[PDB]
Amino acid sequence: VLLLDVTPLSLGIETMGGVMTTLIAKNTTIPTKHSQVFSTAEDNQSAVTIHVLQGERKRAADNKSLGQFNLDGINPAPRGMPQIEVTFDIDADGILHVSAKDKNSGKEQKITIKASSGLNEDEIQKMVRDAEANAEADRKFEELVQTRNQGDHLLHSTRKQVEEAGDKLPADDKTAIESALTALETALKGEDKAAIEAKMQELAQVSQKLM
């Protein structure tokens, strides 16, 4: 064939830390359907937001918003336990259906996005150019967020350790840990990836007893 319908830009959702995660790649032929399982970012999270985005940038905020919906009633459980299956389906007339379903509870929610939604031809071409012009920065951003997300998990894992051990932990070891937690928490708010890893390392080096 010499012609066909494609979706012109990547389609996906916002994930923890303000990143766009792609479910359907740019220039995929339509109709098409793809699903991927996601989980909760923190312990005891009972509601998630599915924010639908179009574009090629790694910062969710730099892409085009197509709509959003919440899924709630998820049983509060450890981070990573819920299995939320997100499905993007674009039909032959370009209509996008997005659904999310929590596998444990069976709770599901969905939105329908009309074909005319999203960026026009001029904006598409500018999106592709701007993604390319910023590819190194967007990559650094994605690397930064994965480190912040590891760091924030380390902060929460470790805080639950301090409690769990409680009295068993020597006053000296608790104080050094608290103060390494504070430094990491500060580093996490910055945008220097090595600085965060260095503070995670400093924390590991006063946590041997807690470990």
Binding site: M16, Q36, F38, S39, Q45, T49
Partner: peptide, 6 residues
């Protein structure tokens, strides 16, 4: 991957 936090 993880969904945004609460």
């Amino acid at each position: 991957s993880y969904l945004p936090r609460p």
